[PDB]
Symmetry: D2
Subunit: 334 residues, 4 copies
């Protein structure tokens, strides 16, 4: 149901979760905290988007509040999350989207300000992790601090679930060809901890490490220790693709894989896992809200036990909608 | 002393084979045929290159000849390859680089004009196929029409050879993240036979088919039927990467894989297979003449029998230098 | 009672005129001719668009007809325009969008098949030229073959009209920073007539010639011989900008220029000439149907008689909508 | 011997000035200060460059010193510029390249550590500004703190000097189509002071303000108040172009403009101002050390008194070489 939500951070994830909330109408955004972006600039950042276009609606600054579609939103400018007066603003759930308070200890600071539950929109080292359609039924009311995993884990886990349930994944190695992100540089610049990530994003294919495939073993415990992978950052603004190479236990002809994935996309994973037989390219998934879309034509099987499965994901819009979906699911269990 | 070479086609491959021949000095280009590009335009196309820079030397049109570094080259403008007077121009070997005469029957037309041997700089449905460092010792003087396989086969085969020789490849699936090519479109355009390839190259990650992994099974017969793969075209002008996910027969710790690849790069495959432990990105391989460069840091192993190996290749420069190397080898056997 | 339209050519202009016709609902597309693109491929090309997104509606092939939003469209595959049965399909006006039948003689072939009028969606060497909001009132029922000028002319002419009407343009020089087009190459390739245009579109800023400023003197005869310009093609998939540097007769303070442009955008040029004071960038105009949008903030004046005026244009959508608007106007005059 | 130089900051300008110093051999780099980049990372950042390629020479860390081509360089890590012991390291001139100490008061801090002169590699609000080939002869030994102006001012001023000296510039408006810079963002992000500059660099043409044309009026006093302009940032990694639209006092034919520019490029402005009649595109100027290269073919004249002149500049390499040249000139006057 329509729970009141607070968003910590108005960066790429925070703005798109706010966007998804107003577009879907599943939740009500009532407060936003950002100590670095003032109200007039938030109006501009929310109104215009290079990737997803101008917001379909109205965005104004009125009496110190951000008014989206006539709905006023309280704006906070606190650096310390324990100082945010979430309860005063009426925010029941808080989306922790800054990327710097991902442990339960750090994310728990929001409970001090009056928030009832915290949803970390990033992987967490210790919080319970969820992927809608995969393990969201393991959520219960005793859980006050949870994580929605990453955009990549949300793409891989629904597909891994269907393949493992039907044929059994003996082992798998994944590659994600990922669009550019805010942490990258326009030209060769400093990135002290991750040297390759400092190289010009526009000119390069950049290998990167990702714990997304390993994280699938947390949301699907039977796949713990059976998956790992890496990423390549390429010069596209949005939409990424997962390439899963795996060994199956039971033999599976490629048409049998297509059949079970199509069945899952039409039934229990409708809206989360998509299925296509069309000649799609990455831009066909811009602003697509699925977590994962299986590309039947792009995948290839060496034999009945060794296949490469391809799945597209709008790394911005799929994930943002899953955060709203997770919160709406949580509200139904209150 | 060096073999005199004729080049059919002054497209991307033809110009870069000509550049490799003058840069390496291993062979002498004496004739070029192109029915659509006149002498003045050939000077311009060879002199300036967006990817590899201005040619390191002199290029001018003098008395109807293309003069590169003081060497005059006879220019032909024939549409029918059987009409090119290669013998008159002194061209002993002909590089068939147009991409439209890839069968032994079609490529054989150059023998009518006086050429002694033909090297198809592309895969052929029936010509004997070679990869330098892998099976070039299987070449013999009776072979008048041969193929140098594709750029991607030249990246995968040297790495597959080392891995198979030391550990044994039970099976493998490859993905190549490939730079854009001349067959792609700037904006969504017609590509009747391959619909995805007509979509805008600048805006998209495009899945594509490739027979390069399967072709490794022809150059390394022990791997016949054991490898397959696909490609993703991404918006970079040059430099591609191979991602080989394979299952090994003998156990191999990742440090053992690094050791054998490094050994091969320093010895028998020197200049063909490279090895790096540096934090490299694609642009670090621009104008690199190796067929394949193993990126030790980028690869990942799930266990001692299931690994993902990463190898970079300048899809233009590496291959064009191998065409010149193959010719130099053929000349030594005359 | 909307006019029934036939579209010759399903290239980027033809598809976008069809998309504009269904989106605006001003005209009814009843027939499309393209000898190289079959019905199944037309569904794909219309449905998916890298730049403007998936078509918002339904598009399917049903009993040899292209059905868009339940409206069946007859499909022809004729190479000779005089052989197209436009009359049998019910097409009253024909949009000549192939770019190869731009003279009165060539475009007139469509009248043989039963079309009543022909609108060339490109500049013509001899047909009367129109720009909506500038000289569309000079159209009369005796004109069976007309031209809608080019996208750059449709951007410059509405702005030049307002400036000349209020202050008088003594002389002007225009630069257009233009997005990439279908005539460009992905990598350095052959472009025999225009050498710079063959260079890789993704890697370069390419200077190019344009007769668009000179052609403003044909639609606004008072400006004949007073304007010229050039273009720079840059690696963006869509949206271009005009930069008009002109010498004014009457003194014009920058706030007076803003006032008259804003007035025109709200009144007679509503929908054609836009006006903004927002901090916009090119993506803010993606799928914007205006011919020209004056950017108040980007412009600069040296003195009251020498200014640089900036106007954005979606080179694809704005022009397409003007083709539809021109045909709707012609229909009102029947 | 050659003057010994210290470089404050190892960002894009600092590294490329160091690269220019070793490549040209005009000055000796003996010390570098950067409080955020450690020695091992400096080796990596200097050795590999996506834009200009791997450094032509040797670079290694040895005994806490950066050794380039056998020359050891002392490395400092000071946040306060008054604390850098330039005198101890033997640094006579200091290049202030951080972009944050551009006033004479702030840049003067380097004199406290023992530096004799400071060259600000950026525009300064109060320091004397110089452009090589334009006003470098106005430098004298009493000037301890000077500025080398900006990369755009160094492109425009040599061309403006030739045009004004021969024909007289009554007034001029400039546009620079500029490659992407380190201050831009990969995806829509925060840029509080300049909102348009925070928009995604890969997806957009971004209008920007520049004082570069106005600054030409300081280096060439008889052009004060006669020039202004603006910029468009476009998605290319390097090389930019100046488009000068100017009114001339003495009416000149375009061939007369070509003649005087060619003459200047062959004589007094040799190596500073280039001249070409070739069909060049931006990539043809990658790693070109000229400040400005007049493109004869790209420019357009409306009449004998109103012209648009085009000049290319490698915004990275041209400017860095002028910093070195300015210091070599200062050394000759000691």
């Amino acid at each position: 149901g329509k729970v009141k939500v607070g968003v910590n951070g108005f960066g790429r994830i925070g703005r798109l979760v706010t966007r998804a909330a107003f577009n879907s109408g599943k939740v009500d955004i009532v407060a936003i905290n950002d100590p670095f972006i003032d109200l007039n600039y938030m109006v501009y950042m929310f109104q215009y988007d290079s990737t997803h276009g101008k917001f379909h609606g109205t965005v104004k600054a009125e009496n110190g509040k951000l008014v989206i579609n006539g709905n006023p939103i309280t704006i906070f400018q606190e650096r310390d999350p324990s100082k945010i007066k979430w309860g005063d603003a009426g925010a029941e759930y808080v989306v922790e989207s800054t990327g710097v308070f991902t442990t339960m200890e750090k994310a728990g600071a929001h409970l001090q300000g009056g928030a009832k539950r915290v949803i970390i929109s990033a992987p967490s080292a210790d919080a319970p992790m969820f992927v809608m359609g995969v393990n969201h039924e393991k959520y219960d009311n005793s859980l006050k601090i949870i994580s929605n995993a990453s955009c990549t884990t949300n793409c891989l886990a629904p597909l891994a679930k269907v393949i493992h349930d039907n044929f059994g994944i003996v082992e798998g190695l994944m590659t994600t060809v990922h669009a550019i992100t805010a942490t990258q540089k326009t030209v060769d610049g400093p990135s002290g901890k991750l040297w390759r990530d400092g190289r010009g994003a526009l000119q390069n294919i950049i290998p990167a490490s990702t714990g997304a495939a390993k994280a699938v073993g947390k949301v699907i415990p039977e796949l713990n220790g059976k998956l790992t992978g890496m990423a390549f950052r390429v010069p596209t603004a949005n939409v990424s693709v997962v390439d899963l190479t795996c060994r199956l236990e039971k033999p599976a002809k490629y048409d049998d894989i297509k059949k079970v994935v199509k069945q899952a996309s039409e039934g229990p994973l409708k809206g989360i896992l998509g299925y296509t037989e069309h000649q799609v390219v990455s831009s066909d998934f811009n602003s697509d809200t699925h977590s994962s879309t299986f590309d039947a034509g792009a995948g290839i099987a060496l034999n009945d036990h060794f296949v490469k499965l391809i799945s597209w994901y709008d790394n911005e819009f799929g994930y943002s909608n899953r955060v709203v979906d997770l919160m709406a699911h949580m509200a139904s269990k209150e």
